[PDB]
Amino acid sequence: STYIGTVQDVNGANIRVVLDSSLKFVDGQGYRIGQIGSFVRIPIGYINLFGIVSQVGAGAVPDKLLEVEPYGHRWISVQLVGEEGIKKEFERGVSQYPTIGDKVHIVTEPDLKKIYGTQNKKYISLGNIASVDSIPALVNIDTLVTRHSAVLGSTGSGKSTTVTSILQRISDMSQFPSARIIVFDIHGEYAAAFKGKAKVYKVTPSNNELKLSIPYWALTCDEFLSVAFGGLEGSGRNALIDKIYELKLQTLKRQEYEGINEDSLTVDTPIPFSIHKLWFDLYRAEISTHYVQGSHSEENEALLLGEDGNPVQKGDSLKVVPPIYMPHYLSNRGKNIRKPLEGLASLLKDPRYEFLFNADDWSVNLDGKTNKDLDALLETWVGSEESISIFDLSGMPSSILDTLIGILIRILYDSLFWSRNQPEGGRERPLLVVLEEAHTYLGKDSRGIAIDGVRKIVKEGRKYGIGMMLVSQRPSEIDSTILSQCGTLFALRMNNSSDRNHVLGAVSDSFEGLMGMLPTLRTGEAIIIGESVRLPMRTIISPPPFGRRPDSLDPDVTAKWSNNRVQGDYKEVLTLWRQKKVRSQRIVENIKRLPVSNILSIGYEADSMTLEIEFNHGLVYQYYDVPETLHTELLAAESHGKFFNSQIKNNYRFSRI
Template structure:
């Protein structure tokens, strides 16, 4: 008898096969060709010879529950069963997904050896990248189809501590110039919420940070690239319809004046809207709005202002007028163009002066003067993010206050998508040079209930991005909290250890071939081990992800509590802690001072 024999086919129901284990098969380990194999493991392969070709299936269930219902009484006679899902076949020398025929009753079922696995997974073709090794056969590499990984989108899911960040770093290294396949023209943008990845990619990545370190770039996001209604909501809070309409009219007039003074390529004055991404000055807008709120008049005809100090828009100094009287004598209170938004304007001024928001409200060379003219435009912004000579861009968003994080992620994605969409026929567009956008901590801004610009834009990317060369990789520890539309559009799942039952259910729903037994192993996966399924994988596979070098892993390791508590206590300066807090910069030092760190 062949040493690989497991049993024989006892029942066939579509692609589901019930296998009666042979009496000679004992549980434990089989030694074949000098290698040891675990017998009857859920998720492992079996082979069913069919003359000139072999059928292959994956074990999904073993034990009493795998016994066919019609034969349930046979358990008393000692028969053992397992359930197998047919997934493909080898015709001549190549493996193909799907089957052309079904096995017959009593056909032999064999254990799959590493030589068989090498045929299934080892075929190397152009456009594949190695991401790890088979968990039960370390000599067999696991490859993913890069085209389908990007165009059909993907999700990396795993509980805290499962190795999710390291897996993402490993995947991106494999997809870039650091990988075996060597893609120097790759274009990957990573939204790094916690500032973990700056050290992971070395010389193949450009890092943008609000408070940049040496060798990094300053991250700025021009406020005028956001819809004015969103930025006004952040600056001023709730406004009634009358005030909101009047303010947006002023913004639109400022954009019209800019285009009239200096024609801008691609802008048609007759079709532009208030949302057209054109510069305008928030400081001038504040000044134009505050003046009617505080103005007084020296005459009843309201032609002479009772001005004391003119004020200045660029420095946010409001004009000062003589106080209005209450006895119907000069100076008189203004009632022309008054919106009653003095409190909201005070909040707007505070936000404009707040250094935590300089990256957005005073965006360096993208900050317009009071006439709306800025030194740089969106072309330079996209050139900096996407057009440099390195395959990876890391946008470190850890220094961005949570109050604006969701809006800014939506704006970043909008800038990237709109640029690549409208430039799709050009060499820098998405079709000529596809773009992968990796979204860490996605559950924070892609929730089911949050009607946010980030969620709306990601929905558009996963629905339409395939046609325009824009792919999404969703990374999350809580897949159950992510919007259903977004997760359902992900064609490839890389699922690490998941303990929460609701999260596991989301992954199970995405598994093909009714392989629920594989998903049942999600809670017991080792750190750095993943189940990969979907369009980029030849077959669902349990994989050990290749680890990056120790000095290139994300800064997301757990603190070493025991070691830290054993060593002697170091001097502590809580003044520096508070200074870092106030500067919103964990790298703040007394030598550099808060101003230097914030401005970069």
């Protein structure tokens, strides 16, 4: 029966219990007598006091009786959690404590359902409980979004799949047709989970994936300095700032903006201005030479005339080739910022920085006219048709990732702050932000910009409806003050002895029963602790369906080093390196692709003697010097992964798109 014994001790908010006879198993399923996490019951008069085990064995015996007998290892220790009213509900806080000898009964399925269940409509199931089958874990979305959360755990505990499950659950068009989410990926491992229910922005675009663009003119002057010139400090900073300001005035002169004038134009305001013009006109001073001594006028340019009299190197501003003047009076008008300007020229050269200085549609011509404004940018980022918007930061240079995170957070927060009265603000369609690998940017003494924005969101995000969800595998590195302001926690498996303690050191409801089992939660388990739940749970997050899992398309060396070596020509590698481009010169313009690892479509061509094939995950290859007779043989053989895998797999020089 359920009657397991009676309480033989009490200290107000704690009690102990004795055993039942050897082990007793009930109902025949796979379970055991009250374990560490299990609950128990104590009836009193008309109501019931629920308890939770603490530890089983010599850790709960009364001191002096154990002194009397050493083998008396027959006790467990249970702690009171709450009560059930007069058939009203489970309201924490006990109104009448137990006494010695009173009953204690195991907890059955209906009582656990009453404890965990709930009549409020603002709760939702984001997983499942482990003690009993099929019990939703009613997490509170309101609190979870307006008080911030944090996913923690070692590498293999499965943080990404947990975040995927949560985000899929929140953005269901049946319940929340007007969600709004943003994600930050540091390895781009979510673009595969949300196959066709989100937007993905990348540094290197794809067939049907947009391009990430952050036009440089949306930044503040200070962040622009940080990301372009590496933080100038001398009078170069002042010269640069004045140049930016004057260019923005020139832009506003020929374009009409509503309510912005020379009496209200500040540097940090987001108005278009030319960067190529900035560099050209700043640098021209550093090397200007006037045809006549004692003069500093542009008309005096001492250009080395050519055979026809026209200068050999006229130069050009839109492209970044600067001209050459006659040897030398050199004009003493420019400052001493030659090195920063050379660095800026180099930055402009790189195709790795195109997302800043050559945005696809937000690039600005010489006079400042821009094809599109920022409203479309914001509409794509946050006002799109689909809820979840995903940023792929894998391809960005590793030295400006922190600044980029800061810039994006600042833009989102400021845009949603000033329009908090319109139906597009944060108080009408609340917003959520997710951060991947938060231990490398929120360090205790990080000097970057990301921590400032994250602190601001964590501290003021409750009023303007901006939430946060931190993901990190090294809690001991996250700043303690920030980590303590997260309302909810999903403590997963935690291995090393330092992060476990640092997590215990910032958890409000430190609960003896469940926090001791932290280091051996299975792959998927998550102890959710905080205000988002009435009482701490131990939930197995419901896995997402296959195909909708997070994955990163990193190379597999064992499957690549095994393929028999194919003779390579390194003229191509040197050509690519020198040209500074990742696209070969022998790709065909395009090829019609027809539907059928696997192969989902095979092309062909006769003129160029080229074949093009597509695989899973949008992997497109082009093989060369393959007679189309082999094409028809492959089509006829009905192999689709064997004839290709056995005949032309390692016999022809190929190239990815």
